[PDB]
Design a protein around this ligand. Structure first.
Ligand SMILES: NC(=O)CC[C@H](N)C(=O)O
Length: 225
């Protein structure tokens, strides 16, 4: 059976991928991508915004049909979900106060307080470098960034376009990006393991979108030429 409604697990605090406009509506690159894929499949989207660490459980337990949530494809995750072909390539970045000149890389988080999203690749990357780093873990990244603003952490680590977005969205916070890398986090759309019928349709849609202009129009909307 082809579901007429695809329940899409997504972010709500992960600009420019999944966040809320000024009327509380979900927007972002992943929101636009989901709608485009749904249109090619002939179905409607129902978004389920949720904290990231609950996304794999949601998909495995049948709360959602698909994940478009800035989710990096990893070999370990492929034991938990099936992924589409990659739809985006991200990197990493660290956000610090403008005043700070001690932190230029993950190496420099030595004996510092650092915030990360629970369940993220960022959390894995920082766990590795931590040399006595004090890691604080958050249910969503807006909470992490809250603690940076208040001085509860000295840095927050996330995907590079989200770090940039937080900086652009918060001039009054007097923050800046350091340690930026540009690749190494391929994003994929995930479906339940063994849902080959839906995965094939999603792959085909993505391939068509990259051919026909649809993908490149979404990319330009969010990132420019
Ligand atoms: N929504 C997120 O926080 C995802 C971050 C990272 N790309 C990952 O897959 O862990």
């Amino acid at each position: 059976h082809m579901r007429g409604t695809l329940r899409v697990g997504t972010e709500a605090t992960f600009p420019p991928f999944g966040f809320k406009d000024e009327n509380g509506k979900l927007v972002g690159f992943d929101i636009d991508l989901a709608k485009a894929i749904a249109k090619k499949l002939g179905v409607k989207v129902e978004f389920k915004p949720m904290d990231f660490d609950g996304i794999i459980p949601a998909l495995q337990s049948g709360k959602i049909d698909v994940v478009i949530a800035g989710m990096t494809i990893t070999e370990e995750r492929k034991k938990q979900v099936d992924f589409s072909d990659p739809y985006f390539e991200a990197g990493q970045a660290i956000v610090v106060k403008k005043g700070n000149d001690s932190i230029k890389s993950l190496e420099d988080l030595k004996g510092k307080k650092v915030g990360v999203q629970l369940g993220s690749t960022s959390e894995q990357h920082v766990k590795k470098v931590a040399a006595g780093v004090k890691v604080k873990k958050f249910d969503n990244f807006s909470e992490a960034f809250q603690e940076l603003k208040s001085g509860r952490v000295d840095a927050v680590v996330t995907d590079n376009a989200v770090a940039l977005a937080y900086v652009k969205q918060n001039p009054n916070a007097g923050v800046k990006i350091v340690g930026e890398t540009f690749s190494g986090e391929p994003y994929g759309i995930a479906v339940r393991k063994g849902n080959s019928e839906l995965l094939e349709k999603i792959n085909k849609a993505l391939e068509e979108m990259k051919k026909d202009g649809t993908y490149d129009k979404i990319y330009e909307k969010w990132f420019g030429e």
